């Protein structure tokens, strides 16, 4: 009945993929109990750093990537949810189910990637375990893994970036193309589609 209707929680930043140095590594900044509480309140006072965040809801964990001052992720992870922030829940500024794309204003302290203008097809996918996987671009929204991986390896990395050699954002990881559970290719949201959305 109306009085007892629940609301979905916020997406919560729970860590980040550190790409600053010469070693890439995943860092957790909030544990599960704190994530649960922050999802309910929508109030997150933790400091945010870096370009790739690890994000969670009550039921899923995935990635989100800052590009041109917007924190982007996949709709199949975030739905229409708010994101937790120091001042309470923040509403999505972009929602596009047709593109499997959402975005919120980038949190204070994040750093943004620049959209790629290189026209280059040698790419790199960053996973939630901070693996940096070479990917050859094969079309507007597809690329092949140079070394195939079981899909287990890629699960939870949607919302992460594909980058060019120079570290520009080329796209947002959306889906794995798998045969018999082995991913030989990935599908991504091209950065130009984000740029049009903006
Ligand atoms: C499209 C094609 C060629 C048929 O392929 C596939 O459908 N294959 C599957 C293989 C799944 C096995 C695991 C693969 C491992 C990792 C995958 C990256 C990943 C992920 O980590 N999600 S998550 O755990 O973080 C999760 C917590 C956030 N995404 C998925 O699972 C997505 C979700 C779902 O697809 C979608 O709802 N949309 C809506 C779209 C709108 C436009 C364009 C698109 F393409 C769209 C795809 C199926 N997905 C695949 O990948
Ligand atoms: Zn580039």
Any key phrases for this structure?
monomer, 198 residues, mainly beta, Thrombin, subunit H, seven-stranded antiparallel beta sheet, six-stranded antiparallel β-barrel, 3 helices, 40% strand, binds ligand TSV, binds zinc ion, hydrolase, NS3/4a Protease, Hepatitis C virus, monomeric
Give the structure's gist in a few sentences:
The PDB classes it as hydrolase. The protein is mainly beta. The chain has helices spanning 32-41, 75-78, 191-197, and strands at 12-18, 25-28, 52-56, 61-67, 70-74, 94-96, 101-105, 122-126, 132-137, 142-150, 161-163, 169-179, 182-190.
Task: Indicate the topology.
Elements: E1 12-18, E2 25-28, H1 32-41, E3 52-56, E4 61-67, E5 70-74, H2 75-78, E6 94-96, E7 101-105, E8 122-126, E9 132-137, E10 142-150, E11 161-163, E12 169-179, E13 182-190, H3 191-197
Antiparallel strand pairs: 1-2, 1-3, 3-4, 4-5, 5-7, 6-7, 8-9, 8-11, 9-10, 10-13, 11-12, 12-13
Bound molecules: the ligand CC(C)(C)OC(=O)N[C@H]1CCCCC/C=C\[C@@H]2C[C@@]2(C(=O)NS(=O)(=O)C2CC2)NC(=O)[C@@H]2C[C@@H](OC(=O)n3cc4cccc(F)c4c3)CN2C1=O and zinc ion (ZN).
């Amino acid at each position: 009945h109306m009085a007892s209707m629940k609301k979905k929680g916020s997406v919560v930043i729970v860590g980040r993929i550190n790409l600053s140095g010469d070693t890439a590594y995943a860092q957790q900044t909030r544990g599960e109990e704190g994530c649960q509480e922050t999802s309910q309140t929508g109030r997150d006072k933790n400091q945010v750093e870096g370009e790739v965040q690890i994000v969670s809801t009550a039921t899923q964990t995935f990635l989100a990537t800052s590009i041109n001052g917007v924190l982007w992720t996949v709709h199949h992870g975030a739905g229409t949810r708010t994101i937790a922030s120091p001042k309470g829940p923040v509403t999505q500024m972009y929602t596009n189910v047709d593109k499997d794309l959402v975005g919120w204003q980038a949190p204070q302290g994040s750093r943004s990637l620049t959209p790629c203008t290189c026209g280059s097809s040698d790419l790199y996918l960053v996973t939630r375990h901070a693996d940096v996987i070479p990917v050859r671009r094969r079309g507007d929204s597809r690329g092949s893994l140079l070394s195939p991986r079981p899909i287990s390896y890629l699960k939870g990395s949607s919302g992460g970036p594909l980058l060019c050699p120079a570290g520009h954002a080329v796209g947002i990881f959306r889906a794995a193309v798998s045969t018999r559970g082995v991913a030989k290719a990935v599908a991504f949201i091209p950065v130009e589609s984000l740029e049009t959305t903006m």
